[PDB]
């Protein structure tokens, strides 16, 4: 049921400052109005991330998603290695109603899409182990981080009520932590999914890289503010 | 204080002795509720079980099951448990489970087992010699067996090589025994490897059929997902006592708090990574740790030779849990004092003891 297009979706690689965004809670402990110093994994603050007006893109340490998105249009997520039923593939769909993670040897088409008149992009469903559902995740701004560490995937997510036009707003958001997976796989490349009809979307990644942090919590243990401590003399 | 001091007079003044601490009442655990349940239910109550050699295989992962309800349950016949035992396999647990399920005769239980031999235990299934789980079998004669033969079963009989660990064979190849081809008939050399099962009501102790489910426990470096609920025992408050809520173990007096935990977060450290609030897996709400009193203590004497009567200074601990009677009780902002009679008069300060007050000998 999965064909190729004719035409080339060779959206133009467009590259964009990151400026201040990318910023996650590192753990579940709550801190009041205190400065606290921690290295981890973090976007370099000021770095260069790509902008796509949909090629495998390798997966790294962990991956910022960027979304301008409007009425929902991309849907789901692909990870693997080799992408095929010789290596355990990770699937995730967010339609109407829920969202639905699954783990299996999947055997996916060479242009996967969602396809409307659930799941078609896939030919055989092999050795199924792991399986998932819960609450749907989406002029919008979506955010998400993306990390395989020991055996444990981890979501962050944020939604933004945005009006600027372009890039990125110049401002400031911790991103709350989502989704654990307990489940062990060796990811390097991943793919986005898109809900086309048979008859555009624009979105910016960036990789992370361990540094060092400051972050500041108020009273109430909200992240508010944070500083670099690999940038100009001045920060460190 | 004599023997601190390692003589047998002591001078006018205050000495400080030895330390003071409260000590633990009991000890408390709290775990949240613990729910979805792994659905045992169906497969130890399924309405029928297939055949020894297309046994059913189901998989045990990401739930929680309790094993003390099915380890009392007297309907089983044999319940035997090779790598650990049934005691303690509520505690310790693997990353999955895989239940065989099946049917076969009284006198082949022991043949499904570890280092066993046999008709079923080499043409139908196949259990290893280092096998970790259970084996649970109960007799199946009053449901399985049948007035007018129960038939649909079947087990096999006839195959050239025998059965690896948890192997299943279900092919119908005509078996030849002997070196006369057969063109898919019977013939002298050629029979069926699959004999039907002629189980009956009223047949005898043996015959009786019998269901048998196996759990095997296997612990790939995936997190374990399945094992049996952690018990939790209601909170002590007010109370300086050791606690292990969700694993975080601590000493301490509980008391409320009014933080205003965001909705992820589990508890909180003020500085220096020491926890201070924590919140409860059941009531969610946060509640405040704090150290129980400790603090050094002390004794005011007038001299060994003028007198023979000491009072006695615990140093910053309020007036509450001084123990041991003695004379009336002060407090005073350091501390709490035994020993001594308060008075309203001022006079020169002969043996310090803080706050700008001190003690004298007129009594003390
Ligand atoms: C969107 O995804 C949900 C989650 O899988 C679908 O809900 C399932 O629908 C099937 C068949 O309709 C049922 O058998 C499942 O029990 C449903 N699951 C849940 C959790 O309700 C839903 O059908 C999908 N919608 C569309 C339009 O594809
Ligand atoms: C189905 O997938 C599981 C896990 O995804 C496979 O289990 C493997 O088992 C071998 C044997 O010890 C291990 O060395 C591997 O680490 C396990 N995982 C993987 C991803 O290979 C299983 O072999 C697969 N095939 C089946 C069950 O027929
Ligand atoms: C931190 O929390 C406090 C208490 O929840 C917030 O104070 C309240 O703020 C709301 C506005 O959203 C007022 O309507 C209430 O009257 C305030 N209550 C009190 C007791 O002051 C405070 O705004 C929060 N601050 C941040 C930055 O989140
Ligand atoms: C854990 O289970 C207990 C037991 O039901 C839940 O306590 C209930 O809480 C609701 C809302 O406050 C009350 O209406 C019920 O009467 C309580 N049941 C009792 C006291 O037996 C508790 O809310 C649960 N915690 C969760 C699900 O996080
Ligand atoms: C020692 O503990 C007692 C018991 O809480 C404290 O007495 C309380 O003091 C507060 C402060 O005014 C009052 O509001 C309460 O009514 C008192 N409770 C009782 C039962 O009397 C006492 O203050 C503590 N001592 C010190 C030095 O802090
Ligand atoms: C980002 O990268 C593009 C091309 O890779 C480059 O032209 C641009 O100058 C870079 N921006 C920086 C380094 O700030
Ligand atoms: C992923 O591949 C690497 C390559 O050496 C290997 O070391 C690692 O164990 C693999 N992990 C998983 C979960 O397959
Ligand atoms: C099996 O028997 C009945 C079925 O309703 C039930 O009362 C009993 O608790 C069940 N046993 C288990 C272990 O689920
Ligand atoms: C105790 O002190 C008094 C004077 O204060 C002295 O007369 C007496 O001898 C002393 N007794 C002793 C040291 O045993
Ligand atoms: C005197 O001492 C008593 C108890 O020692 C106390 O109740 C009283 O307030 C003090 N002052 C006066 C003026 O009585």
Known sequence: ?236 | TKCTLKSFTVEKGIYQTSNFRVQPTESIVRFPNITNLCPFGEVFNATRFASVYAWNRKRISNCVADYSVLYNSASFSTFKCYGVSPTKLNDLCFTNVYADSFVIRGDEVRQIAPGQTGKIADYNYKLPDDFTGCVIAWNSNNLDSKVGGNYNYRYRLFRKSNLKPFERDISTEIYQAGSKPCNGVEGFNCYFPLQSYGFQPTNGVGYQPYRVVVLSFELLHAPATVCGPKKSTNLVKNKCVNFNFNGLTGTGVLTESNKKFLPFQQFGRDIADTTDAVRDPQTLEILDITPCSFGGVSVITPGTNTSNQVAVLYQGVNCTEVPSTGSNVFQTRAGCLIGAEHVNNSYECDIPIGAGICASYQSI
Request: with cysteine.
């Open chain 1, 1 to 236: 049921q999965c064909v190729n297009l004719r035409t080339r979706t060779q959206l133009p690689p467009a590259y964009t400052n990151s400026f201040t965004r990318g910023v996650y809670y590192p753990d579940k402990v709550f801190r009041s109005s205190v400065l606290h110093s921690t290295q981890d994994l973090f976007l370099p603050f000021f770095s260069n991330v790509t902008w796509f007006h949909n090629p495998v893109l390798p997966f790294n340490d962990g991956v910022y998603f960027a979304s301008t998105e409007k009425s929902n249009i991309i849907r789901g997520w692909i990870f693997g290695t080799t992408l095929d039923s010789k290596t355990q593939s990770l699937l995730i769909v967010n339609n109407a109603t829920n969202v639905v993670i699954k783990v299996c040897e999947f055997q996916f088409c060479n242009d996967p899409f969602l396809d409307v008149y659930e799941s078609g992009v896939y030919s055989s469903a092999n050795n199924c182990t792991f399986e998932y559902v819960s609450q749907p995740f989406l002029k919008n701004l979506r955010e998400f981080v993306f990390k395989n560490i020991d055996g444990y995937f981890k979501i962050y997510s944020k939604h933004t009520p945005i009006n600027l036009v372009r890039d990125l707003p110049q401002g400031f958001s911790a991103l709350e932590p989502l989704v654990d997976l307990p489940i062990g796989i060796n990811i390097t490349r991943f793919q986005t999914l898109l809900a086309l009809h048979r008859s555009a979307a624009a979105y910016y990644v960036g990789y992370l890289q361990p540094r060092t942090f400051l972050l500041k919590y108020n009273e109430n243990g909200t992240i508010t503010d944070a500083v670099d401590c690999a940038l100009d003399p001045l920060s460190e």
